[PDB]
Design a binder for this molecule. Sequence first.
Ligand SMILES: Nc1ncnc2c1ncn2[C@@H]1O[C@H](COP(=O)(O)OP(=O)(O)OP(=O)(O)O)[C@@H](O)[C@H]1O
Lengths: 92, 553, 597, 181
Amino acid sequence: KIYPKLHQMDMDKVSRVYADLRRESISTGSFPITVRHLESILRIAESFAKMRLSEFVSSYDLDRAIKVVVDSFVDAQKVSVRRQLRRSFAIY
Amino acid sequence: ISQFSEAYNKILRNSSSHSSCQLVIFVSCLNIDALCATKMLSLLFKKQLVQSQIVPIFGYSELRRHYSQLDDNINSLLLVGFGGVIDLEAFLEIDPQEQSFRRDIYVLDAHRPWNLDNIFGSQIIQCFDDGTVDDTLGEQKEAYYKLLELNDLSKRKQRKKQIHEYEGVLEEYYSQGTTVVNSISAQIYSLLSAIGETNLSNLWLNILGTTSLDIAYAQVYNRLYPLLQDEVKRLTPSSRNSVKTPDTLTLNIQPDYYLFLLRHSSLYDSFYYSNYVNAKLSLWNENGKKRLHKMFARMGIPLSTAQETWLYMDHSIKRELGIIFDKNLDRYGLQDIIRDGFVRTLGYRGSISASEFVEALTALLEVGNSAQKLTNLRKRWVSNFWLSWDALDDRKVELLNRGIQLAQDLQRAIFNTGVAILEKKLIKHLRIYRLCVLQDGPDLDLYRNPLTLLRLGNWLIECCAESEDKQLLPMVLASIDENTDTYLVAGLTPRYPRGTKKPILNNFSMAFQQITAETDAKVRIDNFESSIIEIRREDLSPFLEKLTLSGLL
Amino acid sequence: NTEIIKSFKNFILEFRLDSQFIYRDQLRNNILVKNYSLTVNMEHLIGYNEDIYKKLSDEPSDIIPLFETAITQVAKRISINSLPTFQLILNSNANQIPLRDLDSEHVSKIVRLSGIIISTSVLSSRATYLSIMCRNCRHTTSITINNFNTGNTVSLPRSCNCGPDPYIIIHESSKFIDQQFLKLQEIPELVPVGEMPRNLTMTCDRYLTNKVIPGTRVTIVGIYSIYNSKNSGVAIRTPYIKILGIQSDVETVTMFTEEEEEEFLQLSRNPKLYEILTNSIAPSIFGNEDIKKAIVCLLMGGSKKILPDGMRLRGDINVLLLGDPGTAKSQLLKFVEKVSPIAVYTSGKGSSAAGLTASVQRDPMTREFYLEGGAMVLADGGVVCIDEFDKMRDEDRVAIHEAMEQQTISIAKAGITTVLNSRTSVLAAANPIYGRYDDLKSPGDNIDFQTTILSRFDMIFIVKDDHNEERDISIANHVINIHTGNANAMQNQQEENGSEISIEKMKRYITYCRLKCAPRLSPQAAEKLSSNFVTIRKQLLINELESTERPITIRQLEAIIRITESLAKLELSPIAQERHVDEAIRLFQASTMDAAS
Amino acid sequence: LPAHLQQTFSPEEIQFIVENEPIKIFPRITWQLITTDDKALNNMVAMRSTEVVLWIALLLKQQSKCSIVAPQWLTTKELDRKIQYEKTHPDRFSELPWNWLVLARILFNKAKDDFHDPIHELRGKIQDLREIRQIKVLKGLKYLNESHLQLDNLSLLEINELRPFITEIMDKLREIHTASL
Ligand SMILES: Nc1ncnc2c1ncn2[C@@H]1O[C@H](COP(=O)(O)OP(=O)(O)OP(=O)(O)O)[C@@H](O)[C@H]1O
């Protein structure tokens, strides 16, 4: 049944918030940032919204969506990631 | 305040010229009620072969951009839809020019109250008050004859109180809800009938023109069916077929429905996108959804059959359809659907409900197409206008099918976006009135057309309140996409469930004038329509607070 | 029953939709044609009589003969021998039905439907008329099949002792027709669920036959019914459906309307006629316009030079999409298939069950043998999409090495050794090994091992995805805009309104073009190029002076040559431009760069 | 320089020609106009038959101030004897108003209202005779040779559209044979 949809307005932040999530995340490892990886965050977002039964994307839906991805990408890093942890704090 | 014929006869002496003519009909503006009356009149001069300009005015001040622009040899003039509120003597000025004046202006407006300056001070007018509300309306008599020309201190103080007495009286009039009386084409047809002409087309046009506001009550129209119904009696091409005939092939009365796209869509969605069906059945929700299907379970209708084209419905499904309606729809309060409103029959090209005929024309309005962009886009509406005027043409029906289809595209997003709004519960109940705003959505450009949210709001206001106790109320609406917070704001009024005891008119339009007479920052009366206004989101918030109070109603 | 004929005859005559009636026109229109056909609009039919439509719809099969036998009547009026009965095709677009649902209720019910055909049978005769005589009595008789739903419906009457049924066939005097025996399958998109798509045999007769290419997306109408046959139960009959009429989405067919040429001429005049197509291919896609551009040149078809001797230039080239995932190249080819009028998307292995090798298979009955078909044959003379090309089994991968150049496949399997013709233009999307580091490596050491696989390829692309912040955030947001409210999708309207290609028309444009112009290069373009590669041939060997291993062939230049007619074909010009050539150089130079790495 | 057509007459031209033909009408009317070649007339009696040129009849009919006479030759029941006469004469094309094609097309534009059931009537009737005349053209058209053509009775409209056909033909034929001499 339920088919969530984002409103492009508040979603602009993620394109901005992602910019933090690539280059700085690029700074370590190789890359391993992927174009596809960003596509996931939406498929991520769609889930919680239906779980919210909102029929459309909400910010709180993204709140998990980002956090789900953040440390997920983080843990892939070496023990040097403890340093990588501190920068991701801005994305929390 | 004069008989139409002699006024029309008055143009006759002013008419034929080489180079002609010179008069110019004003097409003003968006509302279709003018459109029929233009063509009937358009055809009228065709009968006389009378040359003249045809101008689809849009901007309320655009005529000032025009009247102040092209007027040269014009010895006579006719305008439509405007002047019933604001004076062009102020708007144009005018400036009495040479008694036995060089130019005269017919002013078409169906809206009341008339401007105070309209009837009296006959100049270009030819005040259009005839023959609807004369009334009297003996109040305007004291607004001038008393007002004009207006121990001695007692008689002087006695006059002013009388002045304020009449001013106090005159203060109420002209401050009041602006409302249409009746479809102008009808009186024009009366003039058309006055000269004796009755064309099945022309009557159909009245049938067409009458249909224009039919989405909003009647209100007189309820008695105006028979006035047309008499005409269908006044005309009987033959006692019997005479099949088809291949040509005329003419209209007949039918059991019409508030049901939408009847012939032109699957009966299933026909309920689904029907607005009257919407709130009564609460169509957006899944709960009442099946209940309609339950009606097919009552109607004994196959779900796929509802998916089926109206063209191919079984003759059993056909003849029993209304009987099925007779045995079902009343249970749901759907009993007021069936209408005896007239239907054109093109035979080989098919019969059509004028109501359905209208909505296709309505689709032409918003589609089928710095500050210069709005004039550029409004021009597109005018650019898109004649294509709609082209849809007025009879032989050209094929083009109509685009709007016939596109109309189906409209409500699909219409029924779509609105219900999306329903989930968020964006209505502001406030206290004095129900209030809403659209801050966001896809394709607000399509929503830029007043009719877009207008059909929407009407689809909303009746949706949000059936009622839906208690107290049907006027709705607030706004929307924005681009052009720096234009936020078109169109007026909205409560709809009775087939039970308009009072006119109740309009308030906020005066109230919108209250704020435009107020600090009026970023608010724009640029809309020809009083109900609709442009506003910045920046200044509308206080405009809202200014709108919330003072409430005029 | 009888005399319902004239009612159609009335609509055959009495009907005039203003200002001009149609079918009465269509008849004489078909008359000089000797078309012997009529295409009826059923949705139009209801407009005439409401009764006879469903009056027809009740038992449409029985009133089928009520037409063509009637259409001849005034046609015979207009003819004033021998005059075979015309073939009517009625049609309607109104309510389309899923293949997933066919109810026995629909038997003897006409249904319009979209469809995707698996294949069609070789044509076979049906005798509309026959003469027959007693093998005993010497009695003279004649019979016809005037119409039919195969039954068999009729047989030899046994009343001439003499019997049984001594009357016998006479073929010479008898007259005949044809049938296609189509096998159609439902659209793959929906709604197979986890289950395999049902397939259905559609009956095409006379003019119906040959009207449709196998495998094509098609819209069709006809009647649901069932034939007992034998070759089920108890007493159960197998499903079959009549095809009438079939009005199929164009083409889905070398011919087309004349005004189409003009509107294209409007496109041929455009200075941006090529450059707009640069955007059209990738509405959702962002960047890689070079590879994006490299698409179109192959889209118009390759050079065909047949002049003696039998040596002939091939088409269309070869291309490689190799690069790290996130290349969206597989997504690209999915657009590619949609853009090609005839193309096959193959990610295999093969696709989907298709033998990457066109292969041999035996006939179940009567033994024998036949070509089972192959993707090269399926799409022949058209686009080829390939994924996992590195994941391809090397043995039939070998056949690929042949398929691209000689463009003719031959197999000795069983007794049938015949050499098939394959004119397809293949493009290889196979992913490179080990991500980025292979670029740190030689350009080779990827495909198989040897670059001889590359040798047969022409334009091979190595995607370099670099993590540039501004470069991503551009397309990054470009992604979100692709999504609800589908902001990017609404942008195309103004692009559709002002300029940008609709791409379905473009397909018709290309199909138009592909058959239209035969561009032959101007003499000076070659010398401009001959002077070009000789440097490149000499220069890359200067890179080869270090014994650096990577490559170059004279076939490398010939591939470039086909680029000459490529965009020039978009120009429609009879001969290749001098100026036109140059972009091919710098574009192929970008391809040569992949060797440079 | 006409370019197109230009050698053949335009159908719009020939109708422009047939406009010049006089016909009787029933004016609503009771200066002058002098005009040029009309010679007519005294202010015409309302509801009275008078012979006048075609296109002018279109004028007052365009204002609906006049009522055009239906052609006596235009009677569908009467026209059947023609198709009767036509159906029995594989060779001869019988008799023609000679402008009549454009007439019926023009007659039904406006003046349609004057006749008794012209609707769905002669249009089919005229149409049958149109092609049966037209078909007899091509049937006899196989006989086409230099230097003579017995064209006999035909409507100039079809005669116009057929112009490019045969005119381009015999010239080939006449040339090739005479050239062969
Ligand atoms: N130029 C581009 N335009 C549009 N989308 C892109 C582009 N580049 C990457 N993407 C996005 O990245 C994703 C790539 O997924 P896709 O499955 O198409 O990768 P692929 O390159 O086809 O895979 P492979 O490399 O295995 O062939 C898609 O969601 C796509 O939207």
